[PDB]
Ligand binder design. Sequence first.
Ligand SMILES: OC[C@H]1O[C@@H](O[C@H]2[C@H](O)[C@@H](O)[C@H](O[C@H]3[C@H](O)[C@@H](O)[C@H](O[C@H]4[C@H](O)[C@@H](O)[C@H](O)O[C@@H]4CO)O[C@@H]3CO)O[C@@H]2CO)[C@H](O)[C@@H](O)[C@@H]1O
Lengths: 207, 207
Amino acid sequence: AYDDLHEGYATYTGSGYSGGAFLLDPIPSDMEITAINPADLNYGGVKAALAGSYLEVEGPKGKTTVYVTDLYPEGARGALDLSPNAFRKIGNMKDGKINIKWRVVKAPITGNFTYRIKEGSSRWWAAIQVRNHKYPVMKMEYEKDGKWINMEKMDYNHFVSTNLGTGSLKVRMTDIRGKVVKDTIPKLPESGTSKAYTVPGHVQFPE
Amino acid sequence: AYDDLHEGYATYTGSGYSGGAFLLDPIPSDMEITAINPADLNYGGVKAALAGSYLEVEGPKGKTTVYVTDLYPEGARGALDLSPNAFRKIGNMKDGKINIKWRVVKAPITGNFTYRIKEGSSRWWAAIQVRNHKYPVMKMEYEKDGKWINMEKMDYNHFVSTNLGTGSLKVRMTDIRGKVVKDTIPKLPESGTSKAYTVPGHVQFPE
Ligand SMILES: OC[C@H]1O[C@@H](O[C@H]2[C@H](O)[C@@H](O)[C@H](O[C@H]3[C@H](O)[C@@H](O)[C@H](O[C@H]4[C@H](O)[C@@H](O)[C@H](O)O[C@@H]4CO)O[C@@H]3CO)O[C@@H]2CO)[C@H](O)[C@@H](O)[C@@H]1O
């Protein structure tokens, strides 16, 4: 995050803008993105640890920054699958593969987290995704009865729990650096949400 | 051995015609029903094992048959909480509690199972209830990729699984006698269904 380094290879793909595994839609068509190998994605034993992170990637021709929107299933350790507009900046498009170096960097964003409540969520079971986060989200907990409960991060880039209780939810997020922030999310319905929805958050990870 | 009676105590109550734990509503008011204590309800480590079963109950003044619609949360082992139209037939209501002996009997019904697919159910997660069954439903399994998958019975008298797959769902049910029957339910919804729905079945337990 502050400092980090990875060696590997990039190729390029047209997928990941819609229907990517991390459910980060919609992604603007001009956005520089990448899919990420499973080993590096699940950093620290957390599924989709690096989902929605940003990477600076260096190729033979220069450097660029990409947003991580999708899983790269066949990728070895260190391997990335870039969007054409990113690959173009750091490599020769006449090559189908290039040597790269990359690192998690701070998100080029502004403002606070946004939360996405997956359809089917309720007090009984909920999947909560964090968006617009400056650094990878390693951990998400919510308070219930004076105790802090850990949520499992899923392959689809949402933190899940059961019996979260009623009322608004106090949550806290931990980034890849170990930085902790806290926030409150509106209450979950008694019955599974007919549709997914976003809710504005009020914190951000530190610079 | 064969078909033992269970000794216990009965009380009476007007609840269970509506809002019963087993979600068997609506129950017509002329029906003889009972709530049942949790130990006897959860026969075989299976939650709501006796839900929607029928019991013959003998009290000091006679015998009658009742439909099990609800849980008797505070009930001791052996205990039943009957509807008063049932209770009156076997005991004197001026006494609050009576000595009984009871046993599961074949349901006085006809026709096939009727399935109820709980609101919220999809191919991702489904809760499927069996109604109109001649004997307690101890087991429900569905087929996927040529394998049979056990579905956990819940306190609310539905069998539950996840990732049930696509296409029509081949299911099999097992009763308290060990009898197995097989049926087919049409494909589950693409995503969470906002209302519970009904699927008339095409099989019944033998007898
Ligand atoms: O038991 C008490 C209580 O429970 C209620 O039923 C709950 C279940 O307890 C709960 O586990 C169930 O959770 C489902 C959920 O409905 C689905 O929406 C969700 O589907 C996910 C899927 O898991 C993902 O992999 C996929 O990618 O996305 C979808 C969603 O977008 O999966 C979970 C898995 O269990 O939800 C039920 C609530 O409707 C009963 O209704 C209630 O009567 C009981 O009192």
